[PDB]
Amino acid sequence: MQYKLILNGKTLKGETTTEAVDAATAEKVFKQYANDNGVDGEWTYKDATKTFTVTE
C-alpha cells in the first residue's frame, strides 16, 4: 500500500510517500528517511488514512 509521511519542522518540511507492504516496514523506512535528513521529533501514525506525521 501507498503510505504517506508529513513533515513539520524547520530542518525538513512537506510531504513524501512510500510503497510498502505494511505499516511496520513503512515505519522503518520513513524513520530512516528522517535520520538521513537530520530530523528529530515526535511521531504519530493513523491507520485510517495510512499516514505518518513527524513534527520537530
Side-chain angles (χ1 to χ4, degrees):
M1 181 94 181
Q2 272 226 357
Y3 297 89
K4 148 158 294 286
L5 172 80
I6 317 185
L7 302 113
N8 306 133
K10 213 127 205 199
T11 314
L12 241 193
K13 246 213 188 179
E15 292 99 28
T16 315
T17 60
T18 289
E19 176 252 16
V21 301
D22 84 320
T25 307
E27 191 196 314
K28 291 184 24 141
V29 166
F30 285 137
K31 280 153 156 201
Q32 264 194 322
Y33 169 85
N35 282 351
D36 260 295
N37 281 304
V39 181
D40 188 45
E42 306 257 275
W43 288 73
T44 71
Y45 173 69
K46 175 155 138 195
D47 180 76
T49 67
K50 311 308 185 131
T51 282
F52 293 78
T53 308
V54 56
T55 81
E56 240 188 318

